């Protein structure tokens, strides 16, 4: 029981005005029904543009929010987030247990989800996210957290998170394409993959997206 | 950066109206306003030029940034076109996150605070192992201003020392964490209050007191 994503692909939507994440988004809409929806989207046109996408697309909308506060305050961010429809909401673990929990509660309390944020793929998560990432992802197994985010740009990295959450958990990679990471290698161990500007700055969206996809099409589910 | 009575209010109250009235009822005693999530997402970052036009305060975006390098840039981007004159930001996921923040806010002249220990009792599993060395990089990247725990005056003591006096520290914690005013501006420039004003039976009252508590230190 995870949520079922089209094409093991989910669309990181990072442009920054709505005219063209819009178009953006359309174009690839028969090849994507999930869509990530983070800060410089949200902060430049409101938390209303959840409700546009889920107008225009009826897609299902990932809030890449990294919650990273203290419990109260997470509370209240994903209270907001998912009272504006949001059908989940990525969370860091590294503030710890009670800030973690905190999300959890009010995901439970309003029939939503979390994704934990365990290792990150830019190159200074090496200096301090890492060293911690193997506690933080059996913190959240610890907690019941069925949902993970982890890197594609370190293959090794992200198996060993597999392992640690183990088979039936769901795992979302990000750092495919414009940060190097290869989508078929990704999906060894991801159930998806998030790509960003390989799609979204494309001259062809529509064409970006089919050409991952048939990179991918051995390994897709009937 | 010069806080009136070296008291920053969290407005985290979600809704516009309460927001306004308790700010408004609480303007003599403050001219800085730190506003998160909690009313940006409820309300829209509009909010921000609106505290701008009734109070002329400073605006201090704590969105806790916390993504790879080029997101934080534009989310940093979006915060300052909305009117704040500095963001907060976490150090945890390393220098070169840091370092786009601290580029952005050069471009549109704002500040960036620097993150490096939580208050909440779940920073010891993650954060507190980590954060001399998360100030010592910001001490490296030149970060001027700093983010630590009121319900740890030890940590934050430290966190004074590896900055050094020339450098700006706020905190948050005091009041409804049990974090002490007082003592938290032993080492720090200014506190972070939230709930013990904006949730108090009478804000007004709840700010006076806490400025008269901390009296000698202004
Ligand atoms: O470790 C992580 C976690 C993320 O959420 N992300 C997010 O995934 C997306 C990556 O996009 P891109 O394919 O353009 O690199 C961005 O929205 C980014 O904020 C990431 O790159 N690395
Ligand atoms: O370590 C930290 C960092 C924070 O920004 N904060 C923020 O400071 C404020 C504390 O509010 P309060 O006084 O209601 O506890 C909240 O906005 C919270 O998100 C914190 O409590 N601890
Ligand atoms: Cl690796």
Redesign the interface.
């Known amino acids: 029981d995870v949520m079922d994503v089209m094409n093991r692909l989910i669309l990181a939507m990072?442009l920054?005005n709505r005219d063209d994440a819009l178009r953006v988004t359309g174009e690839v809409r028969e090849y994507i029904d999930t869509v990530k929806i983070?800060?410089?989207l949200?902060?430049?046109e409101?938390?209303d543009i959840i409700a546009e996408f889920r107008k225009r697309f009826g897609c299902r909308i990932i809030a890449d929010?990294?919650v990273?506060?203290?419990?109260?305050?997470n509370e209240?961010?994903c209270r907001?987030?998912f009272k504006?429809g949001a059908d989940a909401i990525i969370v860091?673990?590294?503030?710890?247990?009670?800030?973690?929990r905190a999300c959890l509660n009010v995901a439970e309390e309003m029939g939503r989800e979390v994704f934990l944020l365990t290792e990150?793929?830019?190159?200074?998560?090496?200096?301090?996210?890492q060293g911690?990432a193997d506690?933080?992802a059996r913190?959240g197994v610890d907690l019941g957290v069925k949902n993970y985010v982890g890197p594609s740009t370190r293959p090794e990295r992200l198996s060993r998170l597999r392992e640690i959450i183990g088979q039936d958990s769901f795992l979302i990679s990000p750092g495919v394409g414009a940060?190097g990471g290869d989508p078929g290698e990704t999906l060894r161990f991801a159930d998806a993959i998030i790509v960003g500007r390989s799609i979204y700055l494309a001259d062809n969206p529509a064409a970006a997206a089919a050409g991952i996809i048939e990179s991918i099409k051995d390994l897709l589910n009937p």
């Open positions: 990072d920054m983070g800060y410089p949200v902060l430049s409101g938390m929010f990294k990273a506060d203290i419990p109260e305050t209240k961010i907001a987030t504006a860091h673990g590294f503030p710890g247990a009670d800030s973690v990150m793929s830019q190159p200074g998560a090496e200096m301090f996210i911690a506690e933080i913190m940060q």
